[PDB]
Amino acid sequence: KPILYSYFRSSCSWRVRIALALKGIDYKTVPINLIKDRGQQFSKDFQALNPMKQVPTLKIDGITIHQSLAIIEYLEETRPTPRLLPQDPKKRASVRMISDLIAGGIQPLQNLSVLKQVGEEMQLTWAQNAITCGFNALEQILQSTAGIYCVGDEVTMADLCLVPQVANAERFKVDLTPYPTISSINKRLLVLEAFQVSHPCRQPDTPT
């Protein structure tokens, strides 16, 4: 049975939990809380299951896969239904473009011990500028790719990266007023079951 190594409000592991929920794969979560006295990701316990020192990893089918997006595409390739990528290559590129922008273009610029090394004073204003310049970019894309959801009228890998990123912007008190397509898409997905049963307000690494 699949095992996932995750951090309850880690944006990137929420992505995998949504994908597991959408595919209907039962999975065990193994907590690793990442900031309690340098967290268990500076445990050099977690730093060679996946040497990147970070979230997530999925053991499945007798292998271990790191990187949220690589895991999600693995699940897409091996459990097709329901599809997380459209069939048309041109729209698949919109999905990957958007997810890469969030996963590689926005999230790295706001990751947390990115901002332990910033200097506490500049932690937030750098994450805010990062999310605003990204959301400035993203809204612009979604206004032509989006339909009901980020790409068209089906939930895709792009939406799995949207919801956790929008959750961070709110945590950083970033004003989504300028971003109506992002806001609207986010509301429509948060009413779906798989974005709820996976929510950081619904997961394992988690005290009272």
Binding positions for a second copy, rule: CB under 8 A? 47-48, 50-54, 61, 63, 65-67, 69-71, 73-74, 77-78, 89-90, 92-93, 96-97, 100-101, 103-105, 107-109, 114, 117, 126, 133-134, 136-138, 140-141
> Closest CB to a second copy among 133 and 190?
133
Q: How far is the CB of 152 from a second copy (least distance, A)?
A: 14
Strand 63-66: give its sheet, edge to edge: 28-31, 3-6, 57-60, 63-66
> Closest CB to a second copy among 51 and 147?
51
Q: What is the rounded CA–CA span in Å between residue 127 and residue 57?
A: 25
Q: What is the rounded CA–CA span in Å between residue 107 and residue 124?
A: 14
13 is in an annotated binding site: yes
Q: How far is the CB of 178 from a second copy (least distance, A)?
A: 13
140 is in an annotated binding site: no
165 is in an annotated binding site: no
> Closest CB to a second copy among 156 and 199?
156
Q: Residue 120's CB: how many other CB atoms inside 10 A?
A: 8
Q: What is the rounded CA–CA span in Å between residue 195 and residue 191?
A: 7
Q: How far is the CB of 138 from a second copy (least distance, A)?
A: 7
The upper half-sphere exposure of residue 147, i.e. CA atoms within 13 Å in the direction of its Cβ, equals 9
